[PDB]
């Protein structure tokens, strides 16, 4: 459901762009100044997130707990892992 945003220089999308610029400026120690938006597309309400704690054994047979955060956008068939962390050992 990606749709073209017809007017992209309203306060809502200017705010989004300025927030993105601020985040980039913080990470990259840059000094960008937002000017204006050129095009904008939006896809609303289609992002699903799953937080799964699972057990898994490794090549040596040792078992452990993992936490995974998974994003799914069904319309695009997209499934992506955003986090996959080892949490704790399940061996006595």
Q: How far is 86 from 54, CA to CA, in rounded Å?
A: 10
* Residue 65 buriedness (CB in 10 A; 0-12 / 13-18 / 19+): middle
CB-side neighbour CA atoms (13 Å) of 2: 6
CA 7 from centroid of its chain's CA atoms = 25
CA proximity to 36, closest of 58, 57, 3, 7: 7
Q: Contact, 60 vs 21, CB < 8 A?
A: no
Q: What is the dihedral of CA 45, 50, 20, 2, to 10 degrees?
A: -30
Q: How far is 50 from 44, CA to CA, in rounded Å?
A: 18
Q: Please report the resolution in angstroms.
A: 1.8
Q: According to the entry, how was the structure determined?
A: X-ray
Residue with tokens 């892992």: 81
CA proximity to 66, closest of 91, 44, 90, 84: 84
Q: After which residues is the chain broken (C to N over 2.5 A)?
A: none
């Amino acid at each position: 459901g990606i749709v073209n945003v017809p007017n992209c220089n309203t306060t809502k999308y200017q705010q989004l762009a300025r927030t993105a610029v601020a985040i980039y400026n913080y990470h990259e120690q840059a000094h960008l100044t937002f000017v204006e938006n050129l095009n904008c597309k939006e896809q609303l309400g289609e992002g699903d997130y799953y937080y799964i704690t699972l057990a898994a054994t490794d090549d040596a047979g040792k078992k452990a707990i993992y936490e995974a955060k998974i994003g799914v956008v069904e319309s695009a068939g997209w499934t992506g892992v955003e986090e996959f962390k080892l949490v704790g050992s399940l061996e006595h």
